[PDB]
Amino acid sequence: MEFKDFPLKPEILEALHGRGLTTPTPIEAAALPLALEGKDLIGQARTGTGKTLAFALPIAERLAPSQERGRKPRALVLTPTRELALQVASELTAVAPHLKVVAVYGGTGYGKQKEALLRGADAVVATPGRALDYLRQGVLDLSRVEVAVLDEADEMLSMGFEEEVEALLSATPPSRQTLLFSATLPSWAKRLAERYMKNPVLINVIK
Amino acid sequence: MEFKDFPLKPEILEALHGRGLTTPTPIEAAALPLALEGKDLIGQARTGTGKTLAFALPIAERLAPSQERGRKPRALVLTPTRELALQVASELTAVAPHLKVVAVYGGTGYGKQKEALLRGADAVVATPGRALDYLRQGVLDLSRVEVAVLDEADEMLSMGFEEEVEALLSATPPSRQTLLFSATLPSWAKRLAERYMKNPVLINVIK
Numbered sequence: 001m002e003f004k005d006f007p008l009k010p011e012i013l014e015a016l017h018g019r020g021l022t023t024p025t026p027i028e029a030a031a032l033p034l035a036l037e038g039k040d041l042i043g044q045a046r047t048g049t050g051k052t053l054a055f056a057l058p059i060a061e062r063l064a065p066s067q068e069r070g071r072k073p074r075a076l077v078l079t080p081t082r083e084l085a086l087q088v089a090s091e092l093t094a095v096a097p098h099l100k101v102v103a104v105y106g107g108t109g110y111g112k113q114k115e116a117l118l119r120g121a122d123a124v125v126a127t128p129g130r131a132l133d134y135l136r137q138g139v140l141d142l143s144r145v146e147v148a149v150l151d152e153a154d155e156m157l158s159m160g161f162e163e164e165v166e167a168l169l170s171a172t173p174p175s176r177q178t179l180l181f182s183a184t185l186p187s188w189a190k191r192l193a194e195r196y197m198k199n200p201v202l203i204n205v206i207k
Numbered sequence: 208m209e210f211k212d213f214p215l216k217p218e219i220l221e222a223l224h225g226r227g228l229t230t231p232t233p234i235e236a237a238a239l240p241l242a243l244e245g246k247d248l249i250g251q252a253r254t255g256t257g258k259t260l261a262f263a264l265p266i267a268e269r270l271a272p273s274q275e276r277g278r279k280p281r282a283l284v285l286t287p288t289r290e291l292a293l294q295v296a297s298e299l300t301a302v303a304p305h306l307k308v309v310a311v312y313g314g315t316g317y318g319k320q321k322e323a324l325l326r327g328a329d330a331v332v333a334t335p336g337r338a339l340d341y342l343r344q345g346v347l348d349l350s351r352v353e354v355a356v357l358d359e360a361d362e363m364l365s366m367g368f369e370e371e372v373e374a375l376l377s378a379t380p381p382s383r384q385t386l387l388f389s390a391t392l393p394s395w396a397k398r399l400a401e402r403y404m405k406n407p408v409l410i411n412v413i414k
């Protein structure tokens with residue numbers, strides 16, 4: 001199946017087409033039917049392998065546009081690094097032209113990102129330490145998150161973000177959809193699946 | 208996604224709708240994009256009903272009608288039990304109305320099944336012992352198999368059919384597509400995968 005073969009809004013298919021994005025990777029191909037219907041998934045694939053559309057398209061498809069000033073984000077993507085936050089945000093912004101996407105990461109000041117959150121966001125793509133700095137401040141409100149994504153969860157674990165990731169997920173409604181990407185499914189990932197996911201389907205494309 | 212949302216032939220969708228089946232189960236939904244594109248998959252789902260369309264629809268879609276007298280099957284579905292051979296043959300028959308499906312199983316004589324095979328077959332659904340016996344007789348020819356399915360591999364193991372299943376797989380062309388369904392993924396299944404499958408994606412829906 002090409003992306004054209006999935007039940008995607010015409011505007012999303014045209015945004016894909018324009019970027020030369022035609023063909024889901026195998027993890028995407030298997031994940032999309034479930035993810036598009038709101039189901040929780042664990043995607044296990046070789047690190048850095050392409051899987052972004054497995055969560056970006058479900059976010060694009062699930063979230064209608066909003067103009068409401070100071071609205072809280074309806075999608076949260078946690079990723080380990082600024083570099084991945086910037087790359088994912090860019091990919092998501094391109095496939096969800098209707099959504100306000102804000103990247104959040106430390107190693108710079110608070111003002112700029114604080115002002116974006118306070119203005120409005122539909123999707124936040126965040127490194128966990130900086131994201132948590134915001135929740136306890138009262139600036140990041142996670143009470144409307146509909147879709148949470150854990151990107152490169154093994155790296156988040158190796159970096160020592162376990163407690164931050166958990167606290168951030170705990171600040172979201174358990175009624176959300178959760179998508180977990182882990183190369184190796186270590187004990188922490190399995191704890192996440194048990195504590196923070198609902199009957200998640202495992203898709204493993206490490207051949 | 209409903210079955211109508213996949214790229215299936217209209218006559219196959221009509222066959223499904225005529226059986227009252229509109230919606231894939233999660234295993235079916237996640238499997239179909241890859242299976243319809245000819246890729247190998249391991250589907251980990253509970254024993255019993257709920258998985259047939261993950262292999263029956265790819266078989267229906269992949270195989271064009273043929274009228275050749277005495278033709279050899281292009282799909283082989285192995286089941287652990289005689290009851291399931293009959294059940295799966297019936298299910299496949301219904302969704303592939305353009306194909307001749309022949310059930311092969313013990314617990315009865317050899318004549319009717321042998322006559323059916325000699326007349327010709329597009330798909331054979333078999334228990335492993337009877338299938339290997341007909342292979343040895345030169346009645347069942349597996350040289351044209353394009354799709355091989357192992358439905359309920361765990362029971363095949365517990366019943367002691369490992370040798371027979373491996374011999375049958377070995378008798379088919381390695382160019383084929385292979386779909387393996389297992390509730391537990393025991394070692395034997397993993398070694399079958401390693402030997403007989405091509406970079407399979409694993410999809411585990413067990414709750």
Ligand SMILES: Nc1ncnc2c1[nH]c(=O)n2[C@@H]1O[C@H](COP(=O)(O)O)[C@@H](O)[C@H]1O
Pocket residue numbers: 021022023024025028048049050051052053091
């Ligand atoms: N279906 C798809 N087609 C093309 N590029 C994709 C894709 N899904 C996906 O995530 N990408 C990109 O592929 C990148 C990874 O590619 P890699 O490093 O494995 O060559 C990801 O970071 C994305 O930028």
